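Co-fold these.
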Amino acid sequence: GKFLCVPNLEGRWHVDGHTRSEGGNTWEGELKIVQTWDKVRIHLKTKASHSDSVTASIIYDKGIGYQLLYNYRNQVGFAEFRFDADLKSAEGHYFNGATYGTMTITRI
Amino acid sequence: GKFLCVPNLEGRWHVDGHTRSEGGNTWEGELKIVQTWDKVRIHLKTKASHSDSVTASIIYDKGIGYQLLYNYRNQVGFAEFRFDADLKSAEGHYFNGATYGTMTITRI
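Predicted complex below.
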């Protein structure tokens, strides 16, 4: 490519979560993304636990937008986010092997 | 910024050089730029010497284009390049403290 380019995902994000697996409920949390070029670290804080990402990848899809894929360790799951074009929000889901659910994040 | 972006300067470049200090002459060489995001290493090979960069910085100026500034050690000088918009060539100069001159590079 002519330019080496990554979306700027750094900062704090509010999390609206919904556990979709049985007995699951709505929840809230706060995401902290720390980024050095294409290397991203994701910390999620809820009332009930913390998690930090283990490995994360930023990917691009034409017509869809940028996506962040990562595994994480709860106090080992998988999560992914698809960012809107303005990088101010994202919709995502997670799977912890069995719990799974969705998340909406809004940049703070 | 919304995007973390650096010009892709990686590859081999042909060097047309001109020493402008007294008794200076035309010369030729080959440049190798190795790049990890905004960290750049520049190796110049001529018939008479090698040099490797010590510290290098990519900078952007609106209306001028991207520039590469670095110091280097000959077998300690300063050099800078202003790339054309398509990143296929650049014009530059160097100062070794006293020799100084110009360089044109074309991407291979």
